[PDB]
Amino acid sequence: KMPLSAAPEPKRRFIPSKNEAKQIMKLVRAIREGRILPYKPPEEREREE
Amino acid sequence: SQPGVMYIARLPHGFYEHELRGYFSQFGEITRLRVVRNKKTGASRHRAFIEFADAEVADIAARTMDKYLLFGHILTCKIVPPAQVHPDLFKGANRRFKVVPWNKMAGRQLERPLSESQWQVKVAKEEQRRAARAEKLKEMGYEFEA
Amino acid sequence: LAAQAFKLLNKYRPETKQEKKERLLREATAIKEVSKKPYTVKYGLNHVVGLIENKKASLVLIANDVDPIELVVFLPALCRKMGIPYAIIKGKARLGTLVHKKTAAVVAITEVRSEDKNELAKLISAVKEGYLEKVEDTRKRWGGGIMG
Amino acid sequence: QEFSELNLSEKTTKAIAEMGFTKMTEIQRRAIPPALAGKDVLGAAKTGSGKTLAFLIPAVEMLSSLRFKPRNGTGAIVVTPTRELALQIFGVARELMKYHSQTYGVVIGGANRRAEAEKLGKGVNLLIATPGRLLDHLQNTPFVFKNLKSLIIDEADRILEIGFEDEMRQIVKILPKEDRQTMLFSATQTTKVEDLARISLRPGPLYINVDEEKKYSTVEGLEQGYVVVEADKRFLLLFSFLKKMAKKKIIVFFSSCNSVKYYSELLQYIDLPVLDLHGKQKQQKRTNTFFEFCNAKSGTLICTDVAARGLDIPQVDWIVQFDPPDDPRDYIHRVGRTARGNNGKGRSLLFLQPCELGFLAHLKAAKVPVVEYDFPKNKILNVQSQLEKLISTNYYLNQSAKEGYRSYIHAYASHSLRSVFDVHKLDLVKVAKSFGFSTPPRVDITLGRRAYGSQPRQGGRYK
Amino acid sequence: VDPDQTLKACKALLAHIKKAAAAPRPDGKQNLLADEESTVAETPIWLTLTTKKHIHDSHRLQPGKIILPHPLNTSEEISVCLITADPQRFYKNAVADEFPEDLRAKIGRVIDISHLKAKFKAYEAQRKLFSEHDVFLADTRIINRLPKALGKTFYKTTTKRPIPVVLMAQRDPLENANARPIPEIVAEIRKAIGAALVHLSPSTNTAIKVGYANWEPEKLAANIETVIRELVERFVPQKWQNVRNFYVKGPETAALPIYQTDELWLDES
């Protein structure tokens, strides 16, 4: 009736992701250096091409 | 060669009369079929009885369509044993269950003109039911006139 | 029943690499110029086993053609012991297409969005009325033989 | 006499000043000066006089005066009957050693054995313990207890009532005796208590009596109401009650401090205002909160039954026993008398599951009139989905719910009336649903022939 | 209609309700979440009309609103659900900057029609929605689609049918919402909370909730006469003749009459 593990649940399973936060900040640094292109919604890419 | 009666329940709205006959006519010949429906409003009670000519094909259909997830309904396909078959169970089989507007009949009967003495029956019924109601509310106390 | 289960699991597929990078680029430029927990189909053998053991999984779909079959023989008994409804499906490649991989030995669903919780419940009941009791007597018996 | 009269250390004076205690009761004033002189103490005070400070001041003074360190092991050991009493004494000792470099710890049956073993190995100077777990740690775990100078036995009548007689006999046999000061307390005086005082204390005791002689334990002028509610709806019923009996005075009793803390945070989020008295707060906060509740027109205060055992209960409309009572005789008689009140009669409601109905048979044997309260099913405010979403999304509330669930299970397991309240008859899934869980978290409910040719051992050493 | 006769009917009904609620129950138990003042307070008072013929030729599922001098649904225990049509987020923020003293407190949830057909499609979900709140308001733009979204759970009875509110002005959802501005939206909902509801059922009986048993009897009598006058010339066909009975009523008591007949026909007989 109960789980086999009595170990505590890590707080990471209740808060937003930290790996994605680091990835998003790396992307923000890349956009600020102009290395990568920013976000354009798909209808803009369709009417451009 | 005895017929096999089949009880099908948890019917989705749509699997009523001709769809049942066609779909289980793919499974074999059907002698009779009847969907139980309400008296007051013409509407299925999600329940039906289908009589096939062959008992083995009835067992096959009930076995392979028993726990079928159809339109959010898990069906109930169970073969009624030959000893437990009620005699006049397919009384309204192979017939349409017509939707009859009972309340519209009641309203247009309320509209309907009574001629001379049925209004005397009207006021007689009115007066002694008022008398009984008067006894009931004189038990607690509330006076009325007219 | 496999079609119904795959309709629900196709509603809850994970995201591909392109959608993940596209979404992350969207958040990056939104930061340049609020969310709830994502709900997906859970996959991976060790991850799904850990979900079953902790009674987090709600429905488990096990592939039937795992070539080292030892990786999944204990799984029906484990689901029976912990009380999670399970079903054996045809094709690890089918479960693979669902999770954007070539194959998937087992998938599990734990929790869903509100708008189809009832549907998940019905599906669970469906398998536990449509597969678990048809297996209940033959799950214990030896198979095969050339008697005749 | 006030606390500044004795020449205590400045750290101890500052700690008592922060608690807010400036005047003593009789038991403190009559026990602390002889116990600071090194004399063993035999007491007759009840729960709530203030005996906790009366045995904690000499222990803290001894530990500070001999300059104890964590490498020195246990200096003083306080043995308590139940785990919640041990936790209350642990909170008091945490408040008392705010400025003292000495360590303090609790060892109670139902907790992690390995974590307690590591805690004892690192060094706990003041050890507040439960007899079975204390004996287990004294026998099978390596930790230093050779520098023991103070043994306090608290509420010995209850410990002899539960059945820890042989456990305390082995505890007194194991513990060092030379230069050990013993202080034993009991609200009654039985033959087993006399035997324990004879084996433990030295030939010359000092017998101190602080007890009221006019105990009004009459078995006729009482009326105890009860409500039969299944486990998975229990809290919901309470919540509905606590939202329908607004603009009234309600006291609610829970079995543990952890569940009180959890339900306090829960009712803060679920927009029902309450007041909380649990042993994780400052003593000053608790006294101010009880004073505010005592001088209010309405409101509800939630606390532990053992925490409000020593409390001047004011006139309230409802006394609710949500959890099983720790002392059923004391609960029925004294809590019903304080529920009835000096003026217009309040009512004492008890929450019963449909597996503890044998309590009613006990109420049949004691000739206590009962009143059954039923509730409609449609008038229960269903906030179960919101509760489960809150538990699943909030990490602090999830932790508090787990701690309250474990505390409830362990307090239910360590129950005096094991026939009426048996953990094995409890459905853990339903009670965890009451706490707000979809699946019940893992807890430990528990925590022939002799050999052929085997004659009893007559020699050798086993460690 | 003679007003002091309705007044003494209100005294008789309130006296019977008070005497019935104060009677002890003989099973040896007492109600826990109920009190005498609460049992009286939750008891409604009904007004029933027995038109000679049918008022409507079918089942009209949208109620009719009658404004009262003394409004209904005034307790803070009453929780209100608002069913909007275009962006529920817009109306959530509108509630977040509306009247926080009363309207914001009463309004418990605000949902769209899309999320209604998404999350409350099964019968358990709409039964839970029925059990949670007690006053439902719905935008007139989507009130036609509600019989399908909220099925027999909401529309077999009449007590908690959605009350129509106008939230229009004088389409992509996110970029604009064709709605009247906020203070008159507050007035529209406020006016709609306290209002007698008339339900155009086919057959003769039409019961209208008009008050409670904690009320002053003169307030109840004023409510009766106003409900009579706004009921007859607006919803009863062929006006002030079809009327036969106005029965004032308690839910578990008898029907006290206000009898309005010398004649039971029209000209045809």
DSSP string across D39-103: --EEE---TTSSHHHHHHHHHHHHHHHTT--GGG--SEEEE-SSHHHHHHHHHHHHHHTSS----
Contact D441, D405 (CB under 8 A): yes
Q: What 8-state DSSP symbol labels residue E259?
A: B
| Residue D332 to residue D335: CA distance in whole angstroms | 6
DSSP bridge pairs for B30? B52
Burial class for C67, CB neighbours closer than 10 Å (0-12, 13-18, 19+): exposed
| D115: CB partners within 8 A, 6+ apart | none
Q: Whose CA is closest to E263, among D19, C122, B123?
A: B123
H-run or E-run covering D158: helix D156-162
Burial class for C87, CB neighbours closer than 10 Å (0-12, 13-18, 19+): buried
D195 phi/psi in degrees, rounded to 5: -65, -40
Strands E44-50, E246-249: pairing kind: antiparallel
Starting at the earlier edge strand, list the strands of the sheet with D275-277: D275-277, D299-304, D249-254, D318-321, D347-352, D224-228, D370-374, E29-31
Starting at the earlier edge strand, list the strands of the sheet with D41-43: D104-107, D126-129, D76-79, D150-153, D181-185, D41-43, D207-208
Which residues on chain D place their C-beta less than 8 Å from a C-beta of chain A? 393-395, 398-399, 428-429, 439-443
| Residue C72 to residue C142: CA distance in whole angstroms | 18
**Cα dist. D180→C65, D282, E181 in Å?**
72, 32, 82
| Residue E35 to residue E41: CA distance in whole angstroms | 9
Residues of chain E found within 8 Å of residue D379, distances taken between Cβ atoms? 33-34
Inter-helix orientation angle D10-19/D283-294, to 10°: 20
The token pair that represents E149 in the structure block: 């979204």
Sign of CA dihedral B55, B61, B66, B70: negative
Q: Which residues of B39-60 are buried (b: 16+ CB within 10 A; e: fewer)?
A: eeeeebebebbbbbebbebbee
The token pair that represents B51 in the structure block: 């009589």
Count CB neighbours of D308 within 10 A: 21
In angstroms, the separation between the Cα of residue C87 and the nearest Cα of chain D is 21
Number of residues in chain D: 463
H-run or E-run covering C96: helix C92-98
Q: What 8-state DSSP symbol labels residue E248?
A: E
H-run or E-run covering A18: helix A18-32
Chains B/A: 3 or more C-beta pairs closer than 8 A? Answer: no
Count CB neighbours of D46 within 10 A: 20
Please tell me whether residue E65 adopts helix, strand or coil conformation: strand
Contact D193, D157 (CB under 8 A): yes
Which contacts of B100-107 are long-range, i.e. CB under 8 A and separated by 24 or more positions?
Answer: B100/B42, B102/B40, B103/E202, B103/E203, B104/E57, B104/E202, B106/E203, B107/E53, B107/E54, B107/E57, B107/E202, B107/E203
What's the gap between Cα C59 and its chain centre? Answer: 6
Neighbors of chain D with 3 or more C-beta pairs under 8 Å: A, C, E
| Residue of chain C minimizing CA distance to A9 | C54
Residues of chain A found within 8 Å of residue D400, distances taken between Cβ atoms? none
| Residue-by-residue DSSP string for E136-187 | EEEETTTTTTHHHHS-HHHHSSSTTPPEEE-------TTT------HHHHHH
| Residue E204 to residue E244: CA distance in whole angstroms | 10
**Cα dist. D404→D280, D320, D418 in Å?**
14, 18, 21
Contact E130, D382 (CB under 8 A): no
What residue type is D226 in one-letter code?
A: Y
Starting at the earlier edge strand, list the strands of the sheet with C59-63: C42-43, C106-109, C59-63, C86-89
| D76: CB partners within 8 A, 6+ apart | D59, D62, D63, D125, D126, D127, D148, D149, D150, D151, D152
Burial class for B70, CB neighbours closer than 10 Å (0-12, 13-18, 19+): middle
The token pair that represents B35 in the structure block: 């969907």
Residues of chain E found within 8 Å of residue C115, distances taken between Cβ atoms? 115, 118-119
Inter-helix orientation angle D165-174/D131-140, to 10°: 40
Q: Which residue has the tokens 């050493």?
A: D461
| E237: CB partners within 8 A, 6+ apart | E53, E55
Cβ of B69 and C122 within 8 Å? yes
| Residue B134 to residue B131: CA distance in whole angstroms | 5
In angstroms, the separation between the Cα of residue C126 and the nearest Cα of chain B is 7
Q: Which residues of C19-51 are buried (b: 16+ CB within 10 A; e: fewer)?
A: eeeeebbebbbeeeeeeeeeeebbbbeeebbbb
Q: What 8-state DSSP symbol labels residue D348?
A: E
What residue type is D80 in one-letter code?
A: T
Residues of chain C found within 8 Å of residue A33, distances taken between Cβ atoms? none
Strands D41-43, D181-185: pairing kind: parallel
DSSP bridge pairs for D372? D226, E29
Among D386, D388, D433, D438, most C C-beta atoms within 10 A, so best to mutate, is D438
Neighbors of chain E with 3 or more C-beta pairs under 8 Å: B, C, D
| Residue E170 to residue E190: CA distance in whole angstroms | 20
Rg (CA), chain D: 23
| Residue D92 to residue D85: CA distance in whole angstroms | 11
D78 phi/psi in degrees, rounded to 5: -110, 115
Q: Whose CA is closest to C121, among D450, E125, B118, E130?
A: E125
| Residue D101 to residue E28: CA distance in whole angstroms | 61
The region, left, alpha or beta by phi > 0 then psi within -120 to 50, assigned to residue D257 is alpha
Contact B1, B85 (CB under 8 A): no
Cβ of D439 and A2 within 8 Å? yes
Chains B/E: 3 or more C-beta pairs closer than 8 A? Answer: yes
Residues of chain C found within 8 Å of residue A5, distances taken between Cβ atoms? 53-54
H-run or E-run covering D200: helix D191-200
DSSP bridge pairs for E196? E66
Q: Which residue has the tokens 């019968």?
A: E123
Contact B35, B16 (CB under 8 A): yes
| Residue C53 to residue E187: CA distance in whole angstroms | 56
Range 100-129 of E in CB contact (< 8 A) with C: 115, 118-119, 121-122, 124-125
Contact A38, C24 (CB under 8 A): no
Contact D157, D188 (CB under 8 A): yes
Contact D302, D263 (CB under 8 A): yes
| Residue C84 to residue C107: CA distance in whole angstroms | 13
Q: Whose CA is closest to D71, among D24, D30, D125?
A: D125
Strands C86-89, C42-43: pairing kind: unpaired
Closest partner residue to C55 (CB to CB) among A3, A32, A39 is A3
Burial class for B29, CB neighbours closer than 10 Å (0-12, 13-18, 19+): exposed
| D197: CB partners within 8 A, 6+ apart | D42, D156, D184, D205
- Elucidated via: cryo-EM
Closest partner residue to A38 (CB to CB) among C29, C35, C54 is C29
Helix/strand number for chain C, H first, E second: 7, 4
**Cα dist. D191→D160, D187, D197 in Å?**
10, 13, 10
Residues of chain C found within 8 Å of residue A6, distances taken between Cβ atoms? none
H-run or E-run covering D244: helix D234-244
In angstroms, the separation between the Cα of residue C9 and the nearest Cα of chain A is 22
Cβ of D428 and A2 within 8 Å? yes
| Residue E60 to residue E201: CA distance in whole angstroms | 6
Rg (CA), chain C: 18
Range 96-135 of E in CB contact (< 8 A) with D: 128, 131-132
Q: Which residue has the tokens 């006076």?
A: B143
What residue type is E77 in one-letter code?
A: E
Contact E49, E205 (CB under 8 A): yes
Cβ of D382 and E128 within 8 Å? yes
Contact D439, A3 (CB under 8 A): yes
Please tell me whether residue D243 adopts helix, strand or coil conformation: helix
The token pair that represents D427 in the structure block: 């459905």
Q: Whose CA is closest to C40, among C100, C88, C87?
A: C100
| Residue E260 to residue E5: CA distance in whole angstroms | 12
In angstroms, the separation between the Cα of residue C46 and the nearest Cα of chain B is 31
Count CB neighbours of D4 within 10 A: 11
Residues of chain E found within 8 Å of residue D373, distances taken between Cβ atoms? 29-32
| Residue-by-residue DSSP string for D269-296 | HTT---EEE-TTS-HHHHHHHHHHHHT-
Q: What 8-state DSSP symbol labels residue D239?
A: H
Closest partner residue to B67 (CB to CB) among C119, C123, C129 is C129
Q: Whose CA is closest to E64, among E86, E49, E75?
A: E49
| Residue C125 to residue D143: CA distance in whole angstroms | 55
DSSP bridge pairs for C61? C87, C107
| D326: CB partners within 8 A, 6+ apart | D82, D84, D255, D305, D306, D411, D415, D416
Neighbors of chain B with 3 or more C-beta pairs under 8 Å: C, E
Q: Whose CA is closest to D338, among D227, D222, D438?
A: D222
**C129 reaches B (C-beta below 8 A):** yes
